[PDB]
Symmetry: D3
């Protein structure tokens, strides 16, 4: 990494300058999940990159999922699930496990990783200081909308308290659980929650770490892969895409139409993907803008 001449090291850094200018003093929300969360080297790079942002006076906010870890814990506890369509029903018991895994295990790991660089990270959920509330959602299955227990969407966000938290120099690491209007805690899909936090905080950018190069319109044609797309076009394309690309794309839409200047689908399998997408013009991600 040093057989590389130092006059070229210089230009790489200098080309970061226009993005440092654009993001300085701005909040960036990052949905962190997938492989970028399960592999040790990529995890540490992700944390080091949150430290980078904070040491540039940029204000990152991290929203994390953790579907597979909840499943494993429920299996470890011998808790048998009920399934409507493809969805597990979130009984009170399943929520307790979810909350405990998301907040007490997955969030802790990232807080400690980030904090290796300084006292930056702080874990929270909608429960803490009533930072955000949830409204119960229903999913549509094989035709008909259906109840699947204590699952919801972000309802309201204490935009004010959240931004004080970051002006204090903090990186919030959010576990997507929040109570409803009656104090009953729901679990929120982490992709949609990221989009709701981005819009509530006036984020400059929403980053969505996923396990793919970027959005393919005609998957799997190699050259159907697109670099940038507007919301109107992407909305017309949404009904066609793979099962798992929908949440990451629905999020990018609801954020960008909500006023977030751009959402980005970037490849979480690339070390320092966020540095690459934010401070470099050579990213593999897909950028969503309003249109």
């Amino acid at each position: 990494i040093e057989a590389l001449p130092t006059h070229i090291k210089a230009q790489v850094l200098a080309e970061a300058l226009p993005w440092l200018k654009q993001l300085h003093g701005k909040v960036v929300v990052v949905k962190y999940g997938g492989n970028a969360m399960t592999d040790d080297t990529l995890r540490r790079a992700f944390a080091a990159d949150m430290a980078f942002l904070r040491n540039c006076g940029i204000h990152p906010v991290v929203v994390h999922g953790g579907g597979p870890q909840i499943t494993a814990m429920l299996r470890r506890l011998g808790i048998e699930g009920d399934f409507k369509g493809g969805f597990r029903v979130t009984t009170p018991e399943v929520l307790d496990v979810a909350r405990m895994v998301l907040f007490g295990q997955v969030g802790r790991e990232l807080v400690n990783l980030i904090n290796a660089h300084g006292p930056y990270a702080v874990g929270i959920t909608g429960e803490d200081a009533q930072l955000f509330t949830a409204v119960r959602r229903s999913v549509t299955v094989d035709g008909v909308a259906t109840d699947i227990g204590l699952v919801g969407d972000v309802d309201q966000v204490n935009t004010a308290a959240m931004l004080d938290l970051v002006a204090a120099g903090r990186i919030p690491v959010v576990s997507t659980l929040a109570p409803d209007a009656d104090g009953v805690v729901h679990n929120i899909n982490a992709d949609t929650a990221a989009a709701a936090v981005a819009e509530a905080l006036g984020a400059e950018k929403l980053l969505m770490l996923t396990d793919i190069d970027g959005l393919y319109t005609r998957w799997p044609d190699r050259d159907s892969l697109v670099s940038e797309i507007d919301t109107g076009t992407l909305a017309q394309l949404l009904p066609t895409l793979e099962s798992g690309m929908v949440p990451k794309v629905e999020a990018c839409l609801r954020a960008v139409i909500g006023g977030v200047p751009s959402a980005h689908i970037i490849d979480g399998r690339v070390t320092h993907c966020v540095l690459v997408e934010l401070f470099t013009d050579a990213g593999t991600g897909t950028k969503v803008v309003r249109g």
Copy 2:
């Protein structure tokens, strides 16, 4: 509760005035555990009382344990323990479970209970914003000091950041886990941690909720029960007391000699015990002062 004449309701409230004066703008640390934590009616009273303090401009800080809940979860997970003396060894696996139970389950319940009264509670551990660190402890068993894994005492406390957190109008609910100097998270005995937080924050009072009327010098003589005692006297008495009274008493000593004006052993089985001990002269607790 209203067959009681209203001229007597008045005097009860008026007699709270000298303690409102003394605690106004002061931090009070409360170790919350025992039955006050397992019974539904007593839990809700405890939360309502934290709301009371905060709505008097007093600054409560809650430190909670949860020994029995960790044990149950380890049994649920089929994780076999190792025991030196009376102590379970805290392997990395046991810590993960502990952390997840203390922070992801027990702390959450109190945060939501308190927050029924407003956006006050916020959960944290030494991991968040590096608020406090731990140093590995060893226990003495049948003669010889011995290692029992990832267990420690509070090392350093970010006194500054902690008090900003409460000046913002927050009730911190602390789960006693913190990392050491190398980022390795330890579990800390909640009683000792409360005493360390009280001393670090310049608390005016340290409250220790336990499952007993108060300190008995000659248990179980009914009239060996004492109302107030100095540290020097209590230190000479410590080697004699029941197995479980030691941590609550060691804490009261280390706090009061650390400069905390008084520590109190109060009966967590009494509804609104903290209201009674703080704003009334008719408490059953034991008050420890320096001597």
Copy 3:
């Protein structure tokens, strides 16, 4: 007062919690007069209660009258009065005496009483820092409106400066005298002034200490005594009531229609009446709301 079991002392305090929540950080204006001002034990309770409010982070503002004390001083000075209808004419000489008695005697007593609990009280009049101005009033007598000298109503209030004064942690004790637009000081009826200060400061509650159990619609039927009433109903009832109840009722109307959520007519002859009315559901007072 201690033959009363301590589990009942607890519940009295706990039932204060919803009113502590509602008044926290709010201004409460209190018109103080009548017997609550002439009896030593009731005076000290009143002061101790202002200290209570301030030590709950509530912001009391006291407005006081003192009709009988002015009369006595004028008699002591051999100053013969002129009377149109039932009203003494407020010559420049009578105003000087009034101002000197209200501000230099009656207000001083309450400032010192309150200040026994801390550096809270501060005496003022509309003259100080131009906090409020007066406009000359005329009274109606046996048919025709008539001039009775330097008597007026509150004109304008420096809402801003007044609230800075209380955010500093102060209890203003107001003597109802203020200058007009030309610097000519008038004496203002203390009941009406309280209502004007309450409305100007966005008070949460207006308390009116009087010498009666509460409002009687058909005095003196014992069960004509009412617990709560709306402004529209009370306005239709106002033309019927005793000579002295009019000012306290006109005040409650003009405050509540001015946007103050409730005004209260409470019995100043009850020790700690304000504690009882504010933090207890067992008050004898009458609550006025908008309707």
Copy 4:
């Protein structure tokens, strides 16, 4: 006043500049009494001059006496006095009258006069916000120190709260009454109180308005009149001077040795004497400095 050429009007103003520089942002304490207080034209000039100071960003503090007005009121009330030596005994009754006259009459007049120029003046006594306390004094008479009732010297001053009051842009007008350690209000000699306030607030200058051209060492030799003198010299001269010059001179000593850079005895019978002494080199006063 305009037959005077405008190039000379200019130089008068320009010669004020070095004293504007020296006093900018500084507190000046002014003892106001004597004729400067009893004549209408001189009163209005005095008030206009306090407005001048405040509109130069100088921070005046006014301390006033009023001996003759108390005497007249006591005579009006038929309150017979007791006299040890030359001193009236200050019974509780005499204090009430004093307090009421000083605070409720004399202070009010100056507050309104000053306030004709803006919302500047605010009246206070040691009672308000516990701004200062008194300690009972005894006088020496024909040889032996003797008690003369509720008379004292300034004990402690809340320097902090006082300076916040002036940073808010206020002119405090102080009536020299304060409570002792037990809440018992004493009357304080206004000259000595001014000296104590000057020293407590780190005043830059202490002004003493009196009814004389200045200090005469050999009164009444016309040319014994001095322009400046040091404390050591003036202390040796103090035992010789007229009965009434002692308090004004004792004050100047205790202030200047207390660290106040200069005290000044200026002629209150000169219109705008304070403008002349502060912003002009042609004053008749006497300046006391440390030596």
Copy 5:
């Protein structure tokens, strides 16, 4: 200057009080040029007067020209000029000289003069912190508008940053040079720039130091000289006046119609002219108001 009695020194100062009140905490923009800039005694008086304003808590802002000094320097450098009509073309070379003379010579002299009284003055141009921008102007010559190089009018002003600069206690000394939208620095006529700064900063007054007694409507009739005039009247009169009076009059118009309460044409040949015009009713200047 002291054969003048001190009771008259007093009244001169006291008559300043209503203008101290009106200007306290207000910004006053002063165009400084002409003889008031070339004569040593008048220069020092001008600086001492800026110190005066600042030590009254008034916020002066100085805008300076310097036409003749640029001309001399260009002649010293042997830089031959081109002239369309009466105007020199401002080539890039002429701008560099102008900028260097205005900012590096003329502004420095005033900064040091003022700073003899304290750390007040600070020199700037539109280039510093992008405080203001310029738009290229064209002049009209013998009929047709024509380009004369890098000369412009003030375009936009960072009103916010400018007022922070003065709230810090600073006297900005502005050299009228600023960049356009593309970073190309233009030279701005100092009279027009003063008018633009006055309007942008919400100045209370605009002072224009010139080399004349005041505005003459029928120059040179001695009694055509006017004391005050409205914008509508002065606009109808503008097409008639001497060649050099136009810029000072156009400025006063554009300021006063821009909302500045008054602009003043005052005689820079009078020592302390600004003291005379601001704090005295005996000025020779001409006051422009809206009409």
Copy 6:
């Protein structure tokens, strides 16, 4: 610059992280001179790099020289010099030219260049707000110390005001001229001034842009070139080095012994040299530390 794979672009940026952490919120003083100042491409890179620092929340301060430009201007003006030893005597006339060239020409260019990236740069000299003073220096020539006119060293620095200037988000661009204790402006060697500003402001680093690869102990042996050296060693080596390396080395000594953690001699002929030296381990410069 893009035939370079994007996984390597990532690592270049990530390796900046430990230096972003170390410099975040810290002041870095940069002496800017030599070729880095005369070539267009290197100038723009230097400005872009100051923008970089400011957009990382680092606080750069620029100190510039300009010896050759003064010489050229004096020649353009036909001002004949006097020379003692190798030094031109700085007559009042030469200072005026120097001041005008340094502040009115050289500083302006950098302010505008930097400001192309935002409203960051602000030009100043010790004259502005009395930010720093000078003391007259004498040089030693062929044996004997000798006067060479208005040349000096930095005397005192208003550390406070300077750091407020940068906390406002500003890049000060300093022209090394300041007045002495009597207001007489001197010209200060820019290298020594940088060292004095670095020490006064508690700079974290002092950067010295020069026209050489780095310090050579045995110039011109190619491998006498050193990467790091302590002050004690460098002090013993100073008497041997080339004529022009002395000021840059004396500066690095006086800074580092003054408590600045490191001074750096870096090659101003390298594009983005400051990015390379600050955020990369591959710099050609020489680092001076205390020893």
